[PDB]
């Protein structure tokens, strides 16, 4: 099973530096090309760099040349992107991918991606508030309840319900940037009205940039 | 550099329809074009490579073709799980470049939203800010007007909406509208109401509460 | 090990007065990462150093 | 339509 | 600029798809017609009816 896993993404100030890693498994990077590709509101999908670890040859996008360097350690089966002199327009999801694997001339495996946010604003953990079920959140014998995850920076936060046991009927809304420059989102789920008071409902909130982990019990 | 011009940017079809997405290279790229799918919260996933070849494990309803500098992705029988953004990419010359994408959505029958309202929690109120949440659940189509009224006065500039992407199971949308006030302002008033207008409702629906009522 | 060109890039970046230590080491790391990019990397180091005068 | 970082989807 | 040309694609069997083309008015127009022409191969000769000063199109295919 071929897998690529990116890490190292995070909040960084303009002009600052960051180093991303791309850990490969289920194949050897010595047998393929490895690319970095990023994705942003401004430019959509934009190729960043590539390397052929077998011989060390590299190529870069004009927009990052001199500021970013790609490298690979075949002994750890891992590729890296050093990112210096960072700017607002470098904010993006950064993916690593392979090309030419098993002789397929396309990017056939991509990692989950790692978020780089270039900003002068400070990290802030969210407050998590109950969205309690009530007579105003129920109809047809179903009830809605949730958690409001308010005032954090930067993205992302993750929300799960009952440790991932509860997935049916869950809507976690896309984050919205408030005027304060902080993000907020709600996650809601709809459940049988009759289960309220007998079945426990907990939203598990994680905001890794601030090391915030909250498990909030939501009650009638 | 070579650019890839993708059209249309948005396409909506019914389940089982044949849909066509196109990509035009700004100069000859031979057959060096791949197509990727990107689902909500996902990474790009290879569908077709070298213009016309199906990647392993990709459903046979996906096919690609080339005519000169024109590339076409066809989905022969659109399925609910096919809703995603689709991108072409050329690898003929460096830099490899991608198209701007095409968003594919499903058409289904009209469904009115379930409307719910949540007053600020007691926890939140302790901190000087009040968030009131209006929830529109599992509706179609996406268009919907949500207005806030506080003691019957229409609110403006103090609410924000978030809308899920289309659900890959039931093809519906959900939407939250959040009204933000200071604790003091929230305590100045009694009646909080969210009013929803949607094609599936015979007339607009108001969902409300009186601050303090259990 | 490095050639005399490479060493010269290291030395220049090492001495830049307006870089902070994160940036200085980030650029030096880039010189190590990809020697083919030495000239471009030095060029961006110089620009950042200049803008922080 | 523009790519959105939170959803990884084009927003129209 | 940046307008959205909204298009109804009306196939001979009565099935209906909808599309948007974005760009300058001129670019978006050109792409809508180009797309129409492409669909016409599989779906028969098209006719395009412009509505709202060119900003909306109903495009029917003969079969």
UniProtKB/TrEMBL annotation, chain E:
Transmembrane segments: none annotated. It comes from the Bacteria. This is Protein L.
């Amino acid at each position: 099973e071929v897998q690529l896993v990116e890490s190292g993404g995070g909040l960084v100030q303009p002009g600052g530096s960051l180093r991303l890693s791309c850990a490969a498994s289920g194949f050897n990077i010595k047998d393929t090309y490895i690319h970095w590709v990023r994705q942003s509101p401004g430019k959509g999908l934009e190729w960043v760099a590539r390397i052929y670890p077998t011989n060390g040859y590299t190529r870069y996008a004009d927009s990052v040349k001199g500021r970013f360097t790609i490298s690979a350690d075949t002994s750890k089966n891992t590729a890296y992107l050093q990112m210096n002199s960072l700017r607002a327009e470098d904010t993006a999801i950064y993916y690593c991918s392979r090309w030419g694997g098993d002789g397929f001339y396309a990017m056939d495996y991509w990692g989950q991606g790692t978020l780089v946010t270039v900003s002068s604003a400070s990290t802030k953990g969210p407050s998590v508030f109950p969205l309690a079920p009530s007579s105003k959140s129920t109809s047809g014998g179903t009830a809605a309840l949730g958690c409001l995850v308010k005032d954090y920076f930067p993205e992302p936060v993750t929300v799960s319900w009952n440790s991932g046991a509860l997935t049916s009927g869950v809507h976690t809304f896309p984050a919205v940037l408030q005027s304060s420059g902080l993000y907020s989102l709600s996650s809601v789920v709809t459940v049988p009205s009759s289960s309220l008071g007998t079945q426990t409902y907990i939203c598990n909130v994680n905001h890794k940039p601030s090391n915030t982990k909250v498990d909030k019990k939501v009650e009638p | 550099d070579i650019q890839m011009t993708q059209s249309p940017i948005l396409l909506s079809a019914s389940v089982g329809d044949r849909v066509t997405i196109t990509c035009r290279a700004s100069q000859d790229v031979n057959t060096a074009v791949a197509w990727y799918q990107q689902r909500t919260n996902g990474s790009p996933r290879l569908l077709i490579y070298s213009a016309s070849f199906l990647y392993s494990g990709v459903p046979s309803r996906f096919s690609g073709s080339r005519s000169g500098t024109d590339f076409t992705l066809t989905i022969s029988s659109l399925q609910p799980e096919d809703i995603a953004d689709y991108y072409c990419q050329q690898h003929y010359t460096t830099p490899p470049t991608f198209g701007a994408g095409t968003k594919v959505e499903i058409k289904r029958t009209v469904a009115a939203p379930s409307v719910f309202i949540f007053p600020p929690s007691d926890e939140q109120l302790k901190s000087g800010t009040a968030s009131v949440v209006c929830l529109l659940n599992n509706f179609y189509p996406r268009e919907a007007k949500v207005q806030w009224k506080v003691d019957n006065a229409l609110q403006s500039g103090n609410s924000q909406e978030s809308v899920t992407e289309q659900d890959s199971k039931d093809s519906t949308y959900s939407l939250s509208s959040t009204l933000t006030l200071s604790k003091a302002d929230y305590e100045k008033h009694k009646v909080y109401a969210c009013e929803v207008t949607h094609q599936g409702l015979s007339s607009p629906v108001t969902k409300s509460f009186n601050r303090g009522e259990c | 090990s490095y050639n005399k060109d490479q060493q010269s890039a290291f030395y220049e970046i090492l001495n830049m007065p307006n870089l902070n230590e994160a940036q200085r080491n980030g650029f030096i790391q880039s010189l190590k990462d990809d020697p083919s990019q030495s000239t471009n990397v030095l060029g961006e180091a110089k620009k950042l150093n200049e803008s922080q005068a | 339509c523009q790519f959105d970082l939170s959803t990884r989807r084009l927003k129209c | 600029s940046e307008v959205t040309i909204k298009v109804n694609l009306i196939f001979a069997d009565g099935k209906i798809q909808t599309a948007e083309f974005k760009g300058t008015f001129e670019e978006a127009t050109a792409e809508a017609y180009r797309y129409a022409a492409l669909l016409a191969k599989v779906n028969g000769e098209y006719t395009a009816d412009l509505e709202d000063g060119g900003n909306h199109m109903n495009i029917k295919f003969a079969g």
